[PDB]
């Protein structure tokens, strides 16, 4: 982390370059155990994540990624399905471009003055993922992560992803109504209150 802001606002090139640099600078600092460990998550990403949401892989990864703590606070963006947000209803489907100011306020009332828990192995990005990146869900996140949290980049196959473990509590603040690539998403800024 030689030089990097809290948030790379809509900067894909700088995020990718810095994530390459940190992936290299971590790969030539780590040991062989996580070298043979992270491939398991790399090729069964859903399995180990939905298991950590037989313990050798989880323990090795937790130990190897609770050791790369970040100093500056950061802002991260990931797409999160609003099915774990106590929103048991549906908001949209994948291609229905319309969101309504009748379920927008319902989402506002559902997530308000409530600290939702969020813990588990997962994947995030370093920038605003619009116009070209995958858009699996109509809820973008704007988590704010404090100092001393786990972080590691890793190059899957010439493409770079990033893993974080979390003992988190999201603590939402507001909800924007972004329209990007002709679609109505909710951008949700949140501030971590660590337990």
């Amino acid at each position: 982390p030689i030089e990097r802001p809290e948030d790379f606002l809509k900067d894909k090139e700088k995020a990718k370059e810095w994530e390459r640099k940190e992936a290299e600078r971590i790969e030539q600092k780590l040991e062989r155990s996580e070298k043979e460990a992270l491939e398991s998550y790399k090729k069964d990403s859903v399995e180990i994540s939905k298991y950590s949401q037989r313990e050798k892989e989880y323990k090795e990864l937790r130990n190897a990624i609770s050791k790369n703590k970040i100093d500056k606070p950061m802002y991260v963006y990931y797409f999160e399905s609003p099915e774990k947000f106590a929103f048991n209803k549906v908001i949209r489907t994948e291609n229905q471009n319309e969101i309504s100011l009748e379920k927008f306020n319902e989402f506002k009332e559902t997530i308000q003055n409530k600290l939702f828990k969020q813990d588990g192995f997962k994947d995030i990005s370093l920038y605003e993922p619009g116009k070209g990146d995958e858009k699996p869900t109509p809820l973008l996140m704007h988590l704010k992560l404090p100092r001393n949290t786990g972080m590691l980049p890793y190059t899957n196959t010439n493409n770079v992803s990033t893993l974080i473990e979390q003992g988190y509590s999201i603590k939402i603040d507001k909800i924007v109504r972004i329209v990007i690539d002709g679609k109505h998403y909710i951008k949700a800024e949140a501030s971590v209150v660590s337990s």
Partner: protein, 335 residues
Amino acid sequence: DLDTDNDNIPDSYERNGYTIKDLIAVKWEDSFAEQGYKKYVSNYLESNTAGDPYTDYEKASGSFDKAIKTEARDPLVAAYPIVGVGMEKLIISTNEHASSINKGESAYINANVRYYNTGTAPMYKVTPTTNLVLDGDTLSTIKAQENQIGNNLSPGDTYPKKGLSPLALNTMDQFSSRLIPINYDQLKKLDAGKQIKLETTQVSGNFGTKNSSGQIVTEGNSWSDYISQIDSISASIILDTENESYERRVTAKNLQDPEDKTPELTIGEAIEKAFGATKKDGLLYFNDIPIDESCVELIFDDNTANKIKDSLKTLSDKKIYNVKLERGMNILIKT
């Protein structure tokens, strides 16, 4: 409720007509006709209906480089910069040594040129390849170098804008350091009274994509990647008004392909969509001038003429503007 090409336009809307409100897609109703909204019908199978670099949603919403004209926002009209080069004056410089003459490099030519744009798109780094011909003898083919490069060729504008002098082409080397040679025979032909013509074989340019939030990059984005695609799936329409010319290309449906789902357009519908003309009393008017068939002159080539006659013999309306527009037709309209 379904999207196959994932262009952020649902399949039913793309087939039955849709409009863009608040950068989002909705069904077209008759109430939006009087508000200034237009009806967009596009292909529901691929991401780009006209083949131009902007997708169906970007074209329909106008979320692209804003210098693109309004009539290119229809998905069936291709955002396409048609760039020409007009020659204004030619200078002949004989390098006779006085104190002698060389019979291979006896003359150097300064060609005054000016770039013209006529399509619905700006070419952000204009690089024409121009060959100078003299009695059928192509003297030299010169690509525009760094000195003669042109940025910001807005539609309907000239790179040396009105009130500015033409640009000077005098160098054939890639770095503008070597002057254009002319030998003794073609110098004698030029002095006899023959005139050098200038032709444009290709134009290489760039298009700006609205990357991130308002950022525009015109590096690595070349129009030559889509020149062939647009010239393949389209038909060319040219209007020659007394003061300006307008060249566009309209997407056409293929009967031989069952999986080609581009919407059917007549020639009249194609003209209206490609030109933004207004329907007054049923007729078509383009900027307060008549454009309907009975008031203009139509010129076609052999292929378009044969197709038009055969399809009119098949049809019953016996009107050129009421026949289906096929792929690869040249139509020139003069007023």
